[model samples]
Every structure is written in structure tokens, then in C-alpha cells.
Target: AQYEDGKQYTTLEKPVAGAPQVLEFFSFFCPHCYQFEEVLHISDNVKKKLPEGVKMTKYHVNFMGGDLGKDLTQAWAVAMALGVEDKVTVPLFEGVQKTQTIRSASDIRDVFINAGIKGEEYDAAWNSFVVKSLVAQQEKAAADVQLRGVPAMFVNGKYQLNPQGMDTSNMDVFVQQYADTVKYLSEK
Candidate 1:
């Protein structure tokens, strides 16, 4: 269960480098993660409120069901590698949940293409070094974290939080509280 730093968890590599990062441990197939999408969608205000040099990165955990879990793991890896995660993240999740579609590698590729990514580039990125590295990284994190569920949040690599743990029925309130907690801890 030993974890590798830069492999299983890495710093934000986009939108400028020096930002304080928030890492969300999630799974596309998880119901909670699907539900939490609305919260994440409305996070623009939180983003705007944060002090300069703060960013969020999401890590998909694939420790659940068999093939589908693996598919999502590869999806995140490939998306990150292609540098098109920003493009396909929401669409892929929606396709899996809203459309009740299978999210296999090919399925993800189609999602990527439909989201404006080129087919050839998607294929190339699927087999690229960064994808392979991230796949291994996520696999290792899955084992090391021994996660029981999805939609887990970790701030600055030390604090771990989960939305599913909250009793409140209001998803937005839960998200805001969670963000506030993270902001408090980060500033301390």
C-alpha cells in the first residue's frame, strides 16, 4: 500500500504551475460522483473567491466494479495524457450516467471525438507514454488509498474529505461546506 508521490499524486500541470492545488478522488461510475457533478458545475464562484494561485485537480479512482472501473481509470489516464481532460470530463460522465451508456475505452474515445478532439490524436494519446504512466499511477493510488467510495476530496495531500459522509440532503450546501472547510484548512 505504499504510495508514490509524483506518480499516484502529482501537482497541477495546467493553467500555470504555482497554484495551491485541490485534488478530488472520484469515480465516474459512482452514484455520488454523478450527483456531485452539479456542485462542481456551480463551483465557479468558489473558484473566483479563492485567493490567487489556487486550483483544483481531479483524480479518478477505479477501485470498484470490474471492467467498468478499469474503463474509467483508463479514461482519466488517457484524457490527462491527451491534455483534453477539460474537454471530455463532463461529457464522459454525463454519457455514463445520463445516457446510461457503457464507458469503455472505445466509448470514451467516441466521447472525446464528439467533444471536439480529433480521432487520430485521441488514438495516439490513448497509447502515449503519459497515459501509460498515469494509468500506473492511478492503479497504485487505488491500492494505496484503499478507498471505500468515490467523491473523496484531499487538500494539500494531507486532508481527506468525502461528500457522501455528510448527512445534509442539500448537495449544494454540502459542497459549499466542504469547500469552506478546505479553504479554512488550506489557509491554516
Candidate 2:
């Protein structure tokens, strides 16, 4: 079935500049977000099916995990700035969502350091102006989106998908439906 606006999605007031772009808003403390990445593998699976030139960005929201939430965002922003997200994303999620081992910024530092990222490099990125800027920008974007909850995806920076409106019963259907919705939004 075709996804419909006002049912499965809603358009953003200020559309992000790039068409075919996807923005994912999530929290490390969120279990559904963890499942999306590690268990169901929806993000990577849907990403592989998207039409070429479709870019995806993920922003960590600061509303969860109390004060630690923002620190996690900073950690992730630094990882992105260093281009080492591939090395740390899953680990961070596992620690925070699964094992519940990550408690503070110091825990986050250990994860990065254990991932072969140098202590010096991690410290630099952690304190870098660019990473700080990115963290601030993400906070603004998260606020602008008026997100009701975690694990939200906005396609082309305009259409925000409603998970409850889609068929999320199983892995295959979920990924297919999500990919299809993104494909549809990319054209607008």
C-alpha cells in the first residue's frame, strides 16, 4: 500500500535543502532505537535499498537519560566529526542500551579508546570547536522537529515518518515499508 501524508507522514515547515536526504533522530538510551540498529537492522537494510544520492544523517536527541543524554550526543558528535562512527556507534548503543554499562562521559571515553581511537585524538575531537558546533546544531534541529519520541526519521528533511502508521510487525515488512516511504519522499 502507498504511504499517505497526514497518515504515515507529515511535511516539515522548513525542508532541509537536500532532496533525497534522510535525517534520523534517536537516543542512545532508547531501546527501540537500539533494536532498530542492532536487532531489526532496519537502518542499514533500508539504507541499502534507497535510490542513489539519498543521503542520511542521524541526530542524537538530548531529551533522554537525563543529563547524560547530552553527553552522549557530544560523544557521538565527536565520533562523527572524527569519521569514526563506524567504529563506535554500535558499541555505544550496546553499552547504553544493552549492558547498561555506559554511565558517564568517562564511560564513553573508554568505549572510544578501546575502539583504537587514541586518547589524545578523542580528547581533541571531544573539545574541538567543530564537534561542539555540530552538537549545538543537532540540539537545535531536534528542538525544531518537535519530536514526540525517539527513533524518528525525516525524509528529504521534510516528511517525518509515523511508525505507528506503518507495518512494523516483522523485520522484512518493516524495512520494506520504511524504504518504500523514503523512496516516495525522495521524489518530492
Candidate 3:
């Protein structure tokens, strides 16, 4: 199995000139994407493996067709805009899965409050035009994916790396391949 291109994958959607970018289409509510996070043991590998000069962005998806997806996207965008994605990412998923504490914008803000993000700061970024624009951009980016699921890994916005396409049943290999694929695409 390989991370190479095939008819099953849509090639390029939002390519950055002069360098490759890895777009991770995901949702905090998604069990599989979050599970992939654990399966890949992704953190350390990401810093070491992802090539220099390569850009990676996570697009919160709602492509499954629901209001929650949109809300998740917006919340994530706000989180990113607030410079707290790294802090909030894990908690957001756990909050949804373990406590069901975040269901609305206000609830998301409350979570931030507990995390030490002040009300003034949260309100300023959350309602900022930048966050709103980011939400729209993320939705559009996710829409560009011709595939059907979260944890979708697109390198150079073209090649998708996965077990299904790679002819493997193990996510362990799939994830390793996904990381390797990112490096490979970047070095190309």
C-alpha cells in the first residue's frame, strides 16, 4: 500500500505555490479522526517528519451535512484565531465525547474561560471578521475535498493517504504512510 495518487483521490484543491501543504480535514466530534490522532501517536512524529517549508492546516468539516459541523468549524476557527488551537483541540473533542459540554458558541466560550482565556479576549476574536472569514474558508476548503470522510489527509492538496486507498486494513501503517506521504510530498 502507498500514499500515491489514484482515481479514487482528487488531486489538487488548494495548492500553495513553491511548496506543498498538508490539509487535514477533521472534526472534533469525529470519533475516527480523533481516534487517528491516538493511533498515529501523531504529535512527536509531526514535528520531526513534516518537512520544513511545508504548510499544514486543519479544516474543521461539516461535509456530513449538519448544523453541528458548521458550529464545530466555527468554534475551531475561533479557537485557531484566538491562538489557542493547540490548547483547545484536545479538550474540544474530549468535551464533546466525555462531557457534552460544548454545543453552542457560548458553551465554547465557557470552556475557554476555564482554560484561562478572558471574556474580553474571547469575545474580541470570536466575533471578529477574521474568524468569520476563517470559518468560510475552512468550509470551502473542506468542500473542495471530493472524498467523504474526516481524517482525510491531503498532501499538496492533491494526493490522499489512507488505508482504504493503500490496500491495507491497519491504521497503523496508514498513519505512518500518511506522515511519510507528507514528507515525500514536501520534498518533491
Candidate 4:
């Protein structure tokens, strides 16, 4: 609705090491975060406009160690490890936010399994040390960036873009604006 630099996004402590170097720190439990999914879900549009060599990933913030946030974060990490987040992201969000059926780790696992996300890939992803390590890492990341809200973006570890920074009345145009922001950040 309104745009503010530091409030929407502030400078990062250091450049995140990666090609895209762009990350969205979010939590499924965050209602406002869910809002984007409820309507147009511009994330799809934003990704399409990502330039080559740009890296984009999401970190589900688990501020507390082992609460629901941590649980959801752990699940997201697993999906990432398997590189199936793209397929499962919306379904997973829909599971808890829409159907209101996701309860425990088993429920989370079942979400993937029923979606045909299983076998050795699922085993490795769920038990991967990297996934667990990332779980801890994202919490530190939230602090490292002085994150205050969900769906926040960090571009090249120098510029951060908050969805709230721009207008949301027109979702597609906003997604285009968000993509343009990414392009602007990457070219620098």
C-alpha cells in the first residue's frame, strides 16, 4: 500500500553467497504472507522474469527452535532439498492454510507422499543434514538481516525488497514491478 525503504527493506550485513543471491524470508504461519497466495500469487510471475545467473530461494524463518514455525520451516527445507518446492509449495500452503489439516510431521510427510513425492529422494531430503543445518541457518539469517516481517526479499545481499513496499491493489502489475525491482538490483 505504501513504500518505505528501511521499513520495507534495509541493507544487508553481507552479500548472500549465490548466483541469484535473492531470498525471500517467510513463514506459512504468517497470515499476511498467506494473503499473496490467497489471491493472485505474484511469486509465479516474479520467478518467470528472473534473469539468468540470478539465484532465488526462500528461507522459512523459524524464529524459535522447535515450535510450529520450526516445523513448517523444516518441511519447506525438505522440499527444497528435493528440489520439489516449486511443485509442492502451493499445495503445502493450501494444506495448512486452506484445508486446515496439517498437524504434525507425519501430516507434512503425508502431504508430500500423497503428492507422489517419495522414495529415496524423500528419504534423503527429510533426513539430510543440510536440511537440518539450514533450519538453524535461516533463524540466524533472520537476525543477520534484521528481518521484521514475512515475504521479505534480499537482492544481492545489498538491497532488500519488501512486498509491502509497493502497491498491492493491482497484483499482476505489482508482480511486474517486483520483477523489475529484481532486474534493477541484479544489473547493479
Candidate 5:
């Protein structure tokens, strides 16, 4: 969770192109990421308090990316390419965490369909050039950042916070502190 600047201060190369950038680094298979969903909800509330032009992007960490990572990343890319990131992200989290199911390309595709994305569009998006590009971009970002854990948050490409950075011994306080930090950074 904590890395010295020289050891891990690698900027995300993808153009964020927006003011007040908030990037979340998470993994579908991480139990802590599931526990941190409350932090995300708090982030949403904080977003309501933000000024216009603030951007929040959730980046899934695929430490497991070779064969399995590729599959999950493809699922995320497909959803993002089709502009249904919210529809798939939360449910995909629940599917994996609550249902004890590992997220795979097929599972995500099914979830996308259940969320009302049609078959043809889903197929196209899954295999689209844009989706593939985004997946590669995510991989690059993770590599650049030297990411080793999940549920990490990056504020304005300069600061990274993870659940381990908080007092996780108590869940409520952890959520509150995380939310407060996000609010403070966004407003600053």
C-alpha cells in the first residue's frame, strides 16, 4: 500500500484529459476490494459534493492476467467499450464476491446480457478494437505503477491510497476515513 516515490511513482500514460481525476485500482478476486464497496458508495456521495468536470475512473487490477487475466480484462474492456461499465462493475463484483464465482469472460458476457446488452452488440464490443486497446492500456498502467495489491486509489496521478493505508481493524472507521480523504483531495 505504501511505496516510496522512486520505487513506485510512475504516471499513468493514458491521457486522463479531465479535471479532478480519481482512479481506483481494484481486483475482482480480492476480498478486500469486496469489503471496500462501501468506500465506493461513499465516494459516490462525495462526488455529489464535487464541482463539475470531476472524473472518476475505476481500473480493475489483473495481477492474475496471463490467460485468466486476459479473459477478465476482456470482459471489462467489452463493458467499457459499450459504455456499460456501471452495469457490469457492481454486478460483476457481486457475482464474484457474493456468489463465490470467479469472474470469467463468459460469466461477464452473461451478466452483460442479463443487464440488457443485446447479443450482437455484446459480441461486437467484446471483440472491438477499442476494447482491446483499453485492455492493453490497463495492463500498461498496472505495470507502470508497479501495482501489487487491490483496492488502491490514485488521486490526480500523484497519490495512491489503499485499504491497508487505513485502520481496517474497524470497517466503519475505515470507510469513513477513506471517504473523508477522497473528499478532501477532490475539494483541494
Candidate 6:
């Protein structure tokens, strides 16, 4: 948990468009990312501490699921389009990483449907422009970031987070420290 600027976060090639943005790249198939989602509730926790006007975004990377990766990303977009990410995110992680039952697009759809999303509504969003656009953006950002690992966080589009920069032995303290670091970077 050193906060040395260079040691903690390396600079990006070009700062992302949004100055106060907190961008995360992750995959449901990744156990580390799944642990953050399921055990730490990272996104929800971080969102609560971010400053106003600071944009926060999460991307589902297409590098983990092999042929199913793209479909999983689309599933994330569909959940967002229907405004049910809260209900769907954890289930997707659990299905892929815990139960080990998610195999195809149909399995992903069933996860959403089980979360109370109507099957018909999910089908529409899956084919909608908004969802498609979101998926494309996620894929592009993931590639642009040249991510080396899952659950990677970029602050202000300028600094890439280094988990070694913070202590994680204590979950509560670590989440707080993580959020504080993000807040500090967003303000900087």
C-alpha cells in the first residue's frame, strides 16, 4: 500500500476523455473479479464514495469466455439497457464462477430471466441499438486499455490502479482505502 504516484499507477498513453472517470475492466469468468463482486461488492461500494460528476464505468472484457466472451459482454449490455444490472451482475458472476452452469447465450439469458427480467424484454434489449452500442464501447475500451488483468481500475483516464498500492488483508479497510485512493485520483 504505497501511494507513490509512479509506483501505484502507471500513466496511460493518452488520458481518457473524461477527467474524473473511474473505469473498470473485468470478466465474469475471472475468480478474482468474481470475488470482488460477490465478497466486496466493489462497484457499489466505490460508487458510494466517488465525487459528484465523476463518471464510473464497468466493462466486461471479451478475453475470458473464449467464444462465449462476446455473448457475456452483450449480456452485460442487455442488463444495463433494461436497467437491471443490480439484479443481474452478481448472478452472472455466480453462474459462471460458482455454479459453473453458464455455457451459452441461452444460459446467460436464463440468468437474466431468473432475476425477474421478462424473457421478451431481454430479447428486445439484446437486439437493441443501445445495447449493441454499449457492447461495442466496452470491447473497444478493453482493447484500448490493453488490460493485463481483470478488475483493473483506471482513474481519471490517467492512472491505472495497482492493487499492491493498498493493503487488502482487512476487507473493510481495504475497500475504504481503495475508494479513498480513487477519490484522491479523481480530484487530482
Clashes of each: 0, 0, 1, 2, 1, 1
lDDT of 6 at 155: 85
Q: Which model scores highest in lDDT? A: 2
In candidate 5, what residue range of length 10 has the lowest lDDT sum? 2-11
| lDDT of the candidates, in the order given | 0.64, 0.83, 0.69, 0.71, 0.66, 0.82
Residue-wise lDDT of candidate 6 within 20-76, one digit each (tens)? Answer: 388988898888898788888777788898988877888888888797888999988
**Root-mean-square deviation of every model:** 7.9, 1.9, 3.4, 3.5, 4.9, 1.9
Model 5 pairs whose backbones collide: 65-69
Clashing pairs in 2: none
Residues 135-156, candidate 2, lDDT per residue (tens digit)?
9878877776677798988886
Measured against the true structure, the TM-scores of the candidates, in listed sequence, are 0.76, 0.91, 0.80, 0.81, 0.76, 0.92
lDDT of 3 by residue, 15-134 (tens): 544322777777777787767664555533554788667666777887643776677787788888877877777777777766887777677777778888889988888778999999
Model 3: lowest-lDDT 10 consecutive positions = 1-10
**Candidate 4 global CA lDDT score:** 0.71
lDDT by residue (tens digit), candidate 4, 26-134: 7776666676555656566557777787666678887533476678888888877777877777777777788877777777788788878866667677788998887
Better of 2 and 6 by TM-score: 6
Q: Ranking under lDDT, best-scoring first? A: 2, 6, 4, 3, 5, 1
**Better structure of 2 and 5 per lDDT:** 2
Model 6: per-residue Cα lDDT at residue 123: 93
Error of 5 at 76 (Å): 1.2
- Report the Cα lDDT for residue 110, model 2: 95
Winner by TM-score:
6
